[PDB]
């Protein structure tokens, strides 16, 4: 069966773009990771940065 996309149809009938960011159940080594933060540099001080 085919579609029916016309301006007459209101909200709920316009196509929606969907992307699924699924992942393997943590069995293989991690190859994708999120962004990492950063910190300025301090010289000769009892700082743990």
């Amino acid at each position: 069966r085919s579609y029916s996309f016309r301006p007459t149809y209101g909200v709920g009938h316009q196509p929606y773009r969907v992307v699924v960011l699924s992942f393997e159940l943590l069995h293989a080594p991690a190859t994708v990771c999120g962004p990492k933060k950063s910190t300025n540099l301090v010289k000769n001080k009892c700082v743990n940065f």
Partner: antibody, heavy 120, light 111 residues
Framework: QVQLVQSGAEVKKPGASLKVSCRAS????????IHWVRQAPGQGLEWMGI???????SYAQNFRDRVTMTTDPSTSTVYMELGSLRSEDTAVYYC??????????????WGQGTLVTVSS | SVLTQPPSASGTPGQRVTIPCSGS????????VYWYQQLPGTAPKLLVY???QRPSGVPDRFSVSKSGTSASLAISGLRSEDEADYYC?????????????FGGGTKLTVL
């Protein structure tokens, strides 16, 4: 001249049909979409139908299944047929046009408007 | 009739004229606002589009601002010829149908 000409609604009889011809001049027909506007006395603007220069069409939600409306890219003219008249027809109708991309577009052409009055 | 517009506006002479156009976030917050000036007995004409670009030949006496989900039109130095009709145009999504629903109409009276 760049103008959209539409014939006004004349007097008729119950059980008949009203034919309105909208013609575009001064520019190519396959360059702007065709749009319907309604304005009642002492009221704002309402829109009924859409006819693309070349493609499908969008009818009127309220006036569906009883209005004949199509397109013909030969004489750059369109014909609208109305049946089952009612007192709600008393308004002014604009057979206007819009941009060639819809949505965010400029309504450069305007029509003179047809005064439709139905009474008993 | 979801949109609300004042029936009329009144004020003392010599005061700036402020007209608020407030709706929802779908037509103003998420979409551009079109500002039309309509003459009595004449078809509406687009004057302000996009809130960023303006047609040439339009004096800057009128001012328009957008705050939150609302907009305000401010006119300084009101004159007797400023009595006209003003329309807000935006794309709205309705339960019956989604489209370009315009305003009803504002009428001004000068004594």
């Amino acid at each position: 001249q760049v103008q959209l000409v539409q014939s006004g609604a004349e007097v008729k009889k119950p059980g008949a049909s009203l034919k309105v011809s909208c013609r575009a001049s001064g520019y190519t027909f396959t360059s702007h979409f065709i749009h319907w506007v309604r304005q009642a006395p002492g009221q704002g603007l309402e829109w009924m139908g859409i006819i693309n220069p070349s493609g499908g069409a969008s009818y009127a939600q309220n006036f569906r299944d009883r209005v004949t409306m199509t397109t013909d890219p030969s004489t750059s003219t369109v014909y609208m047929e109305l049946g089952s008249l009612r007192s709600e027809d008393t308004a002014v109708y604009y057979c206007a046009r819009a941009e060639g991309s819809s949505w965010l577009g400029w309504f450069d052409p305007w029509g003179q408007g047809t005064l439709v009055t139905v009474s008993s | 009739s979801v949109l609300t517009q004042p029936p009329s506006a009144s004020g003392t002479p010599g005061q700036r004229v402020t007209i608020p156009c407030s709706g929802s976030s779908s037509n103003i917050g998420n979409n551009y606002v079109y500002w039309y000036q309509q003459l009595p007995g004449t078809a509406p004409k687009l004057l302000v589009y996009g809130n960023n670009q303006r047609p040439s030949g339009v004096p800057d006496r009128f001012s328009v601002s957008k705050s939150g989900t609302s907009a305000s039109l401010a006119i300084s130095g009101l004159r007797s010829e400023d009595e006209a009709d003003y329309y807000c145009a935006a794309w709205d999504d309705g339960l019956s149908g989604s489209g370009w629903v315009f305003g009803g109409g504002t009428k001004l009276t000068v004594l």
